[PDB]
């Protein structure tokens, strides 16, 4: 019970820190609705656009009972994001590096150890939650080397090492 209580305390503290990082004013305890998806993702998880929609709808429903000032209260944001983070951590232990390795291996049936940047971008354009051309260009600039090859092991390691202190 003490370990689970410490888990809750850590989740609440991390969500509070992420909320403070995105407060519109220092000490105002409010975060802009457009910044809510960014704050939730900065709270230490990488959920899909479906979960962005779910969390935004939940926070909007919670804020509907209060004044519709366009800002999300600290209490509501902490409750929603902490519940979602607890759900994620309990349902799956965040082995992000291995999950990304499996996802990248799904695109490499031959096990060549690398994925062509152009083919990978073309596949991502029409598969899954379609991203923008600017997002794809930034991704290939960050990942692809001078030879146009994406070493998915190193890329997954870098993705999982995105400053998330566990």
């Amino acid at each position: 019970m003490s370990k689970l209580n410490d888990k809750h305390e850590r989740v609440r503290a991390r969500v509070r820190e992420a909320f403070i990082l995105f407060e519109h004013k220092e000490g105002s305890r409010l975060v802009d609705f457009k910044d809510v998806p960014t704050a939730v993702r900065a709270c230490g998880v990488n959920p899909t656009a479906v979960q962005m929609t779910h969390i935004l709808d939940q926070l909007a429903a919670l804020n509907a009972e209060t004044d519709a000032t366009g800002y999300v209260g600290l209490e509501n944001f902490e409750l929603v994001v902490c519940n979602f983070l607890i759900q994620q951590e309990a349902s799956l232990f965040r082995d992000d590096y291995h999950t990304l390795l499996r996802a990248f291996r799904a695109f490499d049936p031959d096990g060549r150890g690398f994925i062509d940047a152009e083919s990978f971008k073309s596949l991502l354009t029409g598969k899954g939650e379609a991203l923008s051309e600017d997002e794809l260009a930034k991704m290939m600039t960050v990942a692809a080397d001078g030879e146009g090859k994406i070493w998915y092991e190193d890329y997954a390691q870098r993705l999982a090492n995105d400053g998330r202190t566990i």
Partner: protein, 50 residues
Amino acid sequence: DQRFQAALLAVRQNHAARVIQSYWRGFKKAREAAKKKAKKLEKAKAAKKK
């Protein structure tokens, strides 16, 4: 046989694509937040030095 194999490959590739897109969105947003925090810390240090 080829159509069944291609359908299975397409399904797994779609799942992997969704996962990778979510993780890339998270990574980009985390990098933006880190840059914003670094800029704010530099501003605070500059103000303190005066």
